[PDB]
């Protein structure tokens, strides 16, 4: 058979793994005599940055990468990394499901060896810290906060009066434990599935970003598929999206409960001071990249249709 290698950086219990297992089962049920889909969880194929590069060369076929890091491969991905971009999770989901918005973005990096085929839900990202609770941006002053390898997020930390420490997701637990960083920012699953709540017990819902995870496929590989095979893989990507999103809802609820049981304290800060502190980032990003405005306009229509 033809081996299709698929990587991601999450545990085997995470929604993304469950979605990819559904993908594998869907495709192999229709075409199993021909393809063996192999899913490599928990950074078995490397950190996310490692995997995107392996996808570019075709050493693996498909991987999952946070939108945060894709902006370094093509600047148009920056659009979904803007802080306080979406008014509501409903606005966000409708945006990511709108082909007129996502297709031009997903296809932007074909010359770099890959294209986006779907997205996966990763909730919203908020600050969590070890020693001191975050109630407003000034509480981040003098802290070192881990972010993804994303110039947008580095700039966001600068505007918050803080300092960014970019590193891969698998490094964060030990970096927190050793005191190399003071905190990080993510959805609630980081606390439980990745153990960050063992060290960080203050989780403050500033909800600065809703950053999609993107499923990317090697472009030569994908376009090389025979018509009928491509149709099955495409259907599989839709199943992946659907199963991951359903499982995400379940998992994030369980994560919140388990975090509480672990001793994490959830804080609900006033978001306005965070919004105002990082507003210049959106102004700067839009001014520098004129590809973005029409996507931003379209997102605003969804914000209006699905407000908070
Ligand atoms: O902050 C990060 O690095 C990670 O954040 C979330 O877990 C996201 O789903 C991952 O794709 C990502 O790698
Ligand atoms: Cl990485």
Domains observed in the chain: 1-308 (3.40.190.170)
Spatial contact of 216 and 55, defined as CB atoms under 8 Å apart: yes
DSSP readout, 146-196? EE-S-HHHHHHHHHTT-EEEE--GGGHHHHHHHTS-SEEEE-THHHHTS-G
Rounded CA separation 161/156 (Å): 9
**Residues whose CB is less than 8 angstroms from the CB of residue 258 and which lie 6 or more positions away in sequence, other chains included:** 191, 192
Rounded CA separation 233/30 (Å): 10
Rounded CA separation 240/242 (Å): 6
**Order of all β-strands in the sheet with 144-147:** 163-166, 144-147, 183-186, 125-129, 202-209, 265-267
- Chain-centroid distance of CA 101 in Å reads 17
Rounded CA separation 119/66 (Å): 9
Provide Rg for the chain, Cα atoms.
19
Spatial contact of 209 and 125, defined as CB atoms under 8 Å apart: yes
Please give the torsion angle defined by the CA atoms of residues 74, 151, 296 and 244, in that order, rounded to the nearest 10 degrees.
80
Which atom in ligand 1 lies closest to the alpha carbon of residue 65? 11
User: Method of determination?
Assistant: X-ray
Rounded CA separation 118/107 (Å): 11
Resolution for this PDB entry, in angstroms: 1.7
Centre of ligand 1 to C-alpha 66, Å, is 6
The number of the ligand nearest the C-alpha atom of 252 reads 1
Please give the torsion angle defined by the CA atoms of residues 225, 107, 123 and 69, in that order, rounded to the nearest 10 degrees.
110
C-alpha neighbours within 13 Å on the C-beta side of residue 152: 30
Strands, E, within the chain: which ranges? 2-7, 35-40, 62-66, 114-120, 125-129, 144-147, 163-166, 183-186, 202-209, 213-218, 265-267
β-bridge pairing 125-129 and 183-186: antiparallel
Spatial contact of 127 and 185, defined as CB atoms under 8 Å apart: yes
> How many CB atoms are located within 10 Å of the residue 255 CB?
20
The number of the ligand nearest the C-alpha atom of 16 reads 1
The residue count of the chain comes to 308
Centre of ligand 1 to C-alpha 1, Å, is 32
Rounded CA separation 20/173 (Å): 25
Residue 63, classified by CB atoms within 10 Å of its CB into exposed (0-12), middle (13-18) or buried (19+), is buried
Which atom in ligand 1 lies closest to the alpha carbon of residue 172? 3
Rounded CA separation 202/254 (Å): 18
Spatial contact of 125 and 208, defined as CB atoms under 8 Å apart: yes
Residue 241, classified by CB atoms within 10 Å of its CB into exposed (0-12), middle (13-18) or buried (19+), is buried
Ligand 1 pocket residues where CB is under 6 Å: 9, 48, 66, 122, 148, 169, 186, 190, 213
> How many CB atoms are located within 10 Å of the residue 242 CB?
13
Centre of ligand 2 to C-alpha 55, Å, is 14
DSSP 42: T
In the numeric block, which tokens belong to residue 172? 């964060």
The number of the ligand nearest the C-alpha atom of 52 reads 2
For ligand 1, atom 5, name the residue with the nearest CA.
Answer: 186
Residue with tokens 């918005």: 101
- Chain-centroid distance of CA 167 in Å reads 14
Centre of ligand 1 to C-alpha 106, Å, is 18
Q: Using alpha carbons, select from 125, 120, 122, 123 the residue that is nearest to residue 243.
A: 120
Centre of ligand 1 to C-alpha 98, Å, is 23
Q: Is the dihedral of CA 258, 259, 262, 268 positive or negative?
A: negative
3-state secondary structure of 202: strand
Which atom in ligand 1 lies closest to the alpha carbon of residue 184? 1
Which atom in ligand 1 lies closest to the alpha carbon of residue 194? 7
Residue with tokens 């407000």: 307
């Amino acid at each position: 058979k033809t081996i299709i290698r698929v990587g991601h950086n999450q545990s085997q219990n995470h929604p993304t793994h469950l979605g990819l297992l559904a993908f594998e089962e869907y495709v192999e049920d229709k075409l199993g005599d021909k393809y063996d889909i192999q899913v490599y969880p928990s950074e078995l194929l490397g950190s996310q940055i490692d995997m995107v590069q392996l996808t570019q060369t075709g050493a693996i076929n498909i991987c999952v990468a946070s939108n945060a890091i894709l902006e370094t491969f093509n600047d148009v991905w920056e659009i979904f990394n803007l802080p306080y971009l979406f008014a509501s999770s409903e606005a966000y989901h409708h945006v990511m499901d709108d082909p007129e918005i996502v297709k031009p973005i997903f296809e932007s990096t074909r010359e770099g060896g890959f294209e986006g085929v779907t997205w996966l839900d990763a909730g919203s990202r908020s600050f969590y810290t070890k020693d001191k609770p975050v109630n407003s941006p000034e509480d981040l002053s003098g802290l070192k906060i881990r972010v993804q390898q994303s110039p947008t997020n580095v700039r966001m930390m600068d505007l918050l009066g803080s300092s960014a420490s970019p590193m891969g997701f698998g490094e964060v637990y030990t970096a927190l434990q050793s005191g190399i960083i003071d905190g990080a920012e993510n959805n609630e699953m980081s606390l439980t599935d990745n153990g960050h709540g063992e060290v960080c017990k203050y989780y403050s819902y500033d909800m600065h970003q809703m950053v999609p995870d993107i499923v990317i496929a090697n472009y030569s590989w994908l376009e090389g598929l025979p018509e009928e095979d491509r149709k099955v893989f495409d259907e599989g990507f839709k199943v992946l999206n659907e199963v991951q999103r359903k499982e995400w809802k379940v998992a994030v609820d369980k994560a919140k409960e388990k975090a509480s049981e672990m001793g994490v304290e959830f804080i609900y800060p006033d978001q306005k001071p965070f919004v105002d502190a990082v507003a210049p980032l959106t102004k700067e990003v839009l001014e520098r990249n004129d590809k973005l405005a029409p996507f931003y306009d379209a997102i605003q229509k969804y914000n209006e249709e699905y407000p908070a």
